[PDB]
Amino acid sequence: SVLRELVTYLLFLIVLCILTYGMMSSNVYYYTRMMSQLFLDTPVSKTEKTNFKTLSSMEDFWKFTEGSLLDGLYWKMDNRSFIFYENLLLGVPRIRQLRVRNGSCSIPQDLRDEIKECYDVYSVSSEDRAPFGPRNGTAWIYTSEKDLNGSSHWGIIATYSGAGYYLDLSRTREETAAQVASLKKNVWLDRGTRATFIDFSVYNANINLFCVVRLLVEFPATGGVIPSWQFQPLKLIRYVTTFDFFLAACEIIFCFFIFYYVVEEILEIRIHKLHYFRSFWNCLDVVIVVLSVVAIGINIYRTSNVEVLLQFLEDQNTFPNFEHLAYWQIQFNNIAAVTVFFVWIKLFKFINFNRTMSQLSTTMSRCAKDLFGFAIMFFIIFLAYAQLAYLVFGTQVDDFSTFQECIFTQFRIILGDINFAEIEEANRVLGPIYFTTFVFFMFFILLNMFLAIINDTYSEVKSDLAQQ
Amino acid sequence: SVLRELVTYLLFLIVLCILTYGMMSSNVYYYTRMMSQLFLDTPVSKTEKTNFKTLSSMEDFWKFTEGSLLDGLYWKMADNRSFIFYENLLLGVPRIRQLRVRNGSCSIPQDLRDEIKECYDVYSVSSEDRAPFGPRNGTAWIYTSEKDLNGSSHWGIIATYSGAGYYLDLSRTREETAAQVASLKKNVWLDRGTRATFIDFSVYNANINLFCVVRLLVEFPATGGVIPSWQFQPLKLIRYVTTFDFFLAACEIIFCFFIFYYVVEEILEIRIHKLHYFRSFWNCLDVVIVVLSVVAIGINIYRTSNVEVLLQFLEDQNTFPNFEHLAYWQIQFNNIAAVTVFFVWIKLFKFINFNRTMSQLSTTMSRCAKDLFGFAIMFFIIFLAYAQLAYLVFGTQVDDFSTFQECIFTQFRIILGDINFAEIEEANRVLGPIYFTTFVFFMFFILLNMFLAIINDTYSEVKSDLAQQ
Amino acid sequence: SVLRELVTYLLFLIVLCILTYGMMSSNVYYYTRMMSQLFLDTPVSKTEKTNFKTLSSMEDFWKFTEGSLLDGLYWYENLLLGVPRIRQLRVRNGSCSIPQDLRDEIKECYDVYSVSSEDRAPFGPRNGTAWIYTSEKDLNGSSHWGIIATYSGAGYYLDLSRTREETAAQVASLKKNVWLDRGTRATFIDFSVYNANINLFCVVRLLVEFPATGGVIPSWQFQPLKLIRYVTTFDFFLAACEIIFCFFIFYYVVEEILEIRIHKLHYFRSFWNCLDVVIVVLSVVAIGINIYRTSNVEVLLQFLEDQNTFPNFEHLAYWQIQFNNIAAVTVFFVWIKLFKFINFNRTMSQLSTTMSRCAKDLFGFAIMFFIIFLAYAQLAYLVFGTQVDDFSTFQECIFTQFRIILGDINFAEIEEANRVLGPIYFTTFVFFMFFILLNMFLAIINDTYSEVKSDLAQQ
């Protein structure tokens, strides 16, 4: 009967919960919190109160590189560096830059007598590849992406490739400071500079968990500095304790469960009930199995390609390249979270033990087609308002900089989490009109219509069920 | 057929969306933000923490003029030009201007005609001063007419200021501008008769072809104090530089052709067939769209064809570039285009009837609109009663109720819960809590639920009628 | 016949209200707030801008114990009730397994705190009791249930002196002969104050947690307690109110015993009897806590005059916190109990019948709502677990979602942590909770109401 599928699903849910609990080691948050506090919040020097989060010019960047960055990276107990007497610095950090070439744009002939140099926004088509400055070392010669073992990044202004002009720093402060001073003397960040990256990693042998740090600074063509950061914890020496073997056994059991589910679905689609996509539960099951096999493939691909870590161990005086592992770890985490959410949602298939739950399920299922139909209208109006807000406030308020940001801001307005001190001053007319009309139409019309649909559907289904 | 109208509307929507996405190019928001932070968030000097946004006295204005303004305007690389971020080229020279009133322009009572000798009224063209004052040397001490200055009104916060006044053109280097400002400060140029002050300039930033016009206004009300305001407006005056610009021009021509076709079709449909034609609510939307589109087209044509200011500036680049009319018309065009796009997107409801689910929803909305209007009349009458009570009671102490429209917006924010109850509780110990409690109670317990009652009754009636029939 | 019940309940309610108002203005919150500002707000030293609320390293703690702690403790102008105690909990070297892949550069490891990995060997100069492990039994302490772990009552302890010139010397000696090694995991500081200006005893406990990943985490608790005595007439009035409350609860419990003896076969179908028994058990446990506190309050004044001994007074603070928590829910339930009298009219009867006839459907829908809630909470925990600190633990995720329901979003950390799947989570949660699910509740009630009125017609 149904007991077989119920107990199978319960076992699957239990093993899934164990897997997520194991992959969610306790108090990993504090590790990244301390690292980010050390490298992000300390002022660049003892004189001014500027940190990495509030950089505003190239001079501030040079101060940070020679200031708090070296104070954080190098600690005193070629002796190794322990970040907090616990976090060992692996290899050497690397600093890279991406720049455009002079003449990427065309100055209008009207002003072609007072302006000589123009530089376009960053793009792979219009990036520089020629040597500059004292063309002697690595930092002054372009290196291709393939020869650098790099990939794209998808920053804030644009998406930057993995090539550029790079330099590997040293294991001691006395040499890194000299290298950065030499880079500062012979001008390295010119008007053509568009992006800069600083990468390193730490281990913290106390808990088997690496940490990869990447800091990015963007120089827009209109002047200024935009900073960004990324701290990512990883695990690459998995099998060290008994709990690790337990988690491996759980992963094997999960793979067996996925194989059983997919073979059952294949046998149920192959012959019996051809084109059985008329049920919501079947679509949920196929979505679950697709996400699960994608996650399994990602884990298999990213668990055997640890050649970078193996290579690093032989020569511990080089730069360890752990960016691909971090990217795939993030992707795997996203996929696993979505899969867990859908597996939990699947529990509704079995909660029909009495009349009340069955009635609630019936009224929830029967209104699923009117709610979608009205959601189409609701989102049409929502997107019209969002586009109007984007066009009106798109250059002054910073909550309407992008279309998606406009959508998120409109969703936050419902909760009552907006300023309105900037909306009114950005545009004194047509600013308040938008806000007032949006509030009136969302709160007094559309929500009441959702409520009316739900009320009518529930009453009708209950009355007809009782009558029959 | 309906398919022809649908495909024509989709083509029109695609062209319009292309226009909007092209008009918002790469992030000029950062372009505006860098200048705003440079000129507004910078403290006027090292030891004090006041900036342009928190000016509180005339001495603070003088500190700002000789302080952060000169620091931001002039940057170091014979009489070389200034690049604000090594990228934004300062165009010509900045200009400063002031508007003041006459002495004895008010009427004081005879009772206090001994302890009070001088009096200056509020700003008005009837009360403004036109006579030389102080060391009458140049244009800074002589009235200049609006026509001779090529200016216009502004519509500031307190009043609407004219385009005339006493003006001075600064220099291209910091050393000369500093001396000029010091001379203006020594000989008293800002008295208590001063009513408004303007600072204007522009930059180019050749990297992306986009000018920027900067205007800063400081108002001195007759009751004392200082009110600052600002305006940073990006512009595009050398459009045809790249192939994307030609693509946008072609799309604009296609848009004009679409508008012509739509107006021709509207004239054909209003000519003889359905002479009344106004009882559809879709014909009204169509004529509104056409009117807005033709207004936008006219504004664009009148704006792009009047660029002699740019040529005059390019003839001699040691003079003030006069670019405020272009910014004003750009703002007007932006507003018109935004409203037109909103209504065009709203027009999509004419075609979403592909099954029985959407038909009944649209029927419910159309049937309940006539009752929603009738109840909204009462709702808005009560809303305005509360707003006027708040304006008359808290309107002189809170500043969230200082103006009637501000009271309306404050009530709409109170609905969302974005209010500070303590600031109105202390303004009036009684009648404040009464106001807040009664407003919240009668807004969330009575007025909000009647809309639900009407909508639920209409939806149930429509659905039952359809099912029974 | 219900007139006697209504009048006795009205007297009980007014007695409880006057007792609450007596507890309402105890003016203990303000003293504790401005005494916390004395320790957790003043800069650690004249040059550094940091305080106890913003400790970030071992050096900051070492500067705190020689500085803002000492100057603010020996000088509002409160006096000590003995000697403060400082205790340390540490782990042992080699408590975890270093992987063989990279072990030629790492020699020692220190696992997170646990009873299994706790250290007990005498480290440093074996002079006194600060360098030798003493079991929990001799310390007369219990667990603390900290932020990252729960800590035992044992460890390496040292009692300071009543004179600043000697306590400073002791802590300087502790700093010189290194006491906070890499194995240190937690540090406790405990003391008590009187502040004779306004009679209010206070017990102060401060904790610094050293994670295995480096850094420090501070936490604090200040708890006030009183030595109430018959010094006026108002305190006598409250004493008479307390005796009246005891008589009232005895009355309620004896007649509850009678009513359960006459109808023991069925006693749980009615809802008001369950509320009544909850009220009486809460009242009896609260009064037991109060009598224990007032019986044991006679021992604390022995250390007031002069005593070079540490008073362990954490149980009183814990039970006082529990007493306040119990009193709040007691008055709430004794405010709800008021709802069974207002049922005088026909409209009130219809409303009560509507509310009573839809309890099972509301409970049934609560299960589905909580299933979806837990699914969303687990998704948020998996996505934002290591970045936002509002989702660091599962209960934090649950409470953050509850706050989101009441409109308490931040959305800055959420957006920064994950540029995709963060905004998706926020938008989907808001749309599906503010437009679909939470409405269903009302729908249920709505239908029931209609049905009720309908049968009136048929009646």
Ligand SMILES: *[C@@H]1O[C@H](CO)[C@@H](O)[C@H](O)[C@H]1NC(C)=O
């Ligand atoms: C950039 O190119 C222009 C001509 O294309 C040249 O005049 C100018 O000197 C160049 N800039 C530099 C820094 O070499």
Ligand SMILES: *[C@@H]1O[C@H](CO)[C@@H](O)[C@H](O)[C@H]1NC(C)=O
């Ligand atoms: C470039 O060449 C070498 C680096 O390989 C260095 O010794 C030399 O000083 C450099 N020239 C400069 C910095 O001008």
Ligand SMILES: *[C@@H]1O[C@H](CO)[C@@H](O)[C@H](O)[C@H]1NC(C)=O
């Ligand atoms: C890229 O990886 C290869 C090994 O696959 C290595 O030899 C080379 O040095 C790397 N390039 C760098 C570190 O720039």
Ligand SMILES: *[C@@H]1O[C@H](CO)[C@@H](O)[C@H](O)[C@H]1NC(C)=O
């Ligand atoms: C303003 O005019 C009054 C007479 O109406 C005169 O007494 C006063 O001195 C004048 N103030 C000036 C000129 O500043």
Ligand SMILES: *[C@@H]1O[C@H](CO)[C@@H](O)[C@H](O)[C@H]1NC(C)=O
């Ligand atoms: C007016 O101009 C003359 C000559 O340009 C100058 O010497 C004087 O300082 C100026 N200011 C006066 C007279 O107040």
Ligand SMILES: *[C@@H]1O[C@H](CO)[C@@H](O)[C@H](O)[C@H]1NC(C)=O
């Ligand atoms: C911890 O124990 C290991 C055992 O191999 C030893 O090598 C190491 O020196 C010890 N740590 C200290 C600080 O002595």
Ligand SMILES: *[C@@H]1O[C@H](CO)[C@@H](O)[C@H](O)[C@H]1NC(C)=O
């Ligand atoms: C430990 O030794 C003696 C105890 O006899 C004590 O006086 C001294 O200060 C302590 N520390 C040392 C000797 O470093």
Ligand SMILES: *[C@H]1O[C@H](CO)[C@@H](O)[C@H](O)[C@H]1NC(C)=O
């Ligand atoms: C705790 O009480 C016991 C009583 O047996 C006493 O011996 C001990 O000294 C007290 N605490 C301390 C200081 O260990």
Ligand SMILES: [Ca+2]
């Ligand atoms: Ca299935």
Ligand SMILES: [Ca+2]
């Ligand atoms: Ca038409």
